[PDB]
Amino acid sequence: MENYLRKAALTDMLQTFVPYRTAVELCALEHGGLDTCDGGSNGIPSPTTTRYVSAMSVAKGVVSLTGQESLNGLSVVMTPGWDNANGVTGWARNCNIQSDSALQQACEDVFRFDDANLVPRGSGLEHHHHHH
């Protein structure tokens, strides 16, 4: 339930992302593009792993964290939005761990996500059958 020690670790992991957020915003602001916000280009450092970091990728400002801490098998998908037309500019968080709901309990605590601020994830059904 609590898991404060691991939680604070995940908190620090999130706190490590915080500085990079500015770089993400700088990218989208200066280059006017989310498309330029990839790891290893546009001033954004190349995707790498620190001692505690297991894996992380940077794609169009979106960043996936994989097997981080006890959350082995789990992948967190941080999806920043930059849509002035939708009045939205924030980071959407999602925990994808299919085999271990227990790990989700830990990640969702720090990476907590509101219904409106989570990127939708589904099994097998991602394609939208609109063209009939």
Query: How many angstroms separate the Cα of 58 from the Cα of each of 20, 45, 71, 107?
Result: 10, 9, 19, 19
**E-strand spans in the chain?**
56-59, 62-66, 75-80, 91-92, 95-96
CA 91 – CA 88 distance, rounded (Å): 9
Q: Which of 43, 44, 24, 49 is nearest to 34 (CA)?
A: 24
- Tokens read off for 31: 């280059």
Determine the number of helices (DSSP H) and then strands (DSSP E) in the chain: 2, 5
Secondary structure letter of residue 24 according to DSSP: H
**CA-to-CA distance for 81 and 86, rounded, in angstroms?**
10
**Method of determination used here:** NMR
For the chain, the structural domain boundaries read 1-132
For residue 125, give Cα distances in angstroms to 27, 55, 64, 122: 32, 26, 20, 6
What are the tokens at 37? 């916000």
